């Protein structure tokens, strides 16, 4: 499902020995986290100059020629729950993105949460295991469409 859908668009970030994060091509924007350190792969999308955000913990830029393939529409139209994912299915019950136990580790701090129609909805950043079920600190888009952050208590980046 989503594993094939986000393929060749979710470019991983190297820790110089392994992968420590993922980078997304959203609206011509090379979105990668700031806490994820290292060098991004490829050369078409690696030699660009990125601009820090430091309030949303992302970094953005532009692609020179890949606009024909930089096709990941972001959408804030979001019914509450039942969304696909790289690993499984995520739930947006009670206005909060939720995941079952265990899944999610280092190397998985930058991959998108897709829609039912292949539209990027969320870009995961970290998580916390508390309450009834664990929750995620994640950058999304609100009802008005402005970039917003949703973060639990004690949500260290996994």
């Amino acid at each position: 499902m989503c594993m094939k859908l986000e393929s060749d668009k979710t470019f991983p970030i190297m820790l110089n020995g392994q992968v420590n994060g993922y980078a997304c091509v959203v609206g011509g924007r090379l979105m990668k986290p700031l806490h994820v350190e290292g060098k991004i792969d490829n050369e078409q999308l690696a030699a660009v100059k990125l601009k820090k955000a430091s309030m949303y913990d992302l970094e953005y830029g532009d692609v020179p020629q890949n606009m024909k393939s930089d096709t990941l529409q972001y959408t804030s139209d979001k019914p509450p729950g039942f969304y696909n994912w790289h690993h499984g299915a995520v739930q947006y019950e009670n206005g909060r993105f939720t995941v079952p136990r265990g899944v999610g580790g280092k190397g998985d701090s930058g991959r998108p949460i897709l829609d039912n129609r292949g539209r990027v909805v969320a870009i995961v950043l970290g998580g916390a295991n508390e309450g009834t079920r664990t929750a995620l600190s994640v950058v999304t888009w609100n009802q008005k469409g402005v970039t917003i952050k949703d973060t639990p208590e004690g949500s260290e980046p996994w």
Binding site: M55, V146, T147, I148, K149
Partner: protein
């Protein structure tokens, strides 16, 4: 000899106090503007 002694608060002419205080108040006004826009940025990051 002079009947009085010079004072720094007096020997500087009133128009020169006006010019120096005008430049200093301009600098302080731009600092106040910077703190105002920093407060506005804090309001926006509280809003998000």
């Amino acid at each position: 000899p002079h009947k009085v002694d010079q004072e720094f608060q007096a020997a500087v002419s009133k128009t020169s106090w006006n010019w120096l205080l005008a430049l200093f108040g301009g600098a302080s006004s731009l600092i106040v503007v910077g703190l105002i826009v920093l407060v506005c940025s804090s309001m926006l990051i509280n809003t998000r």
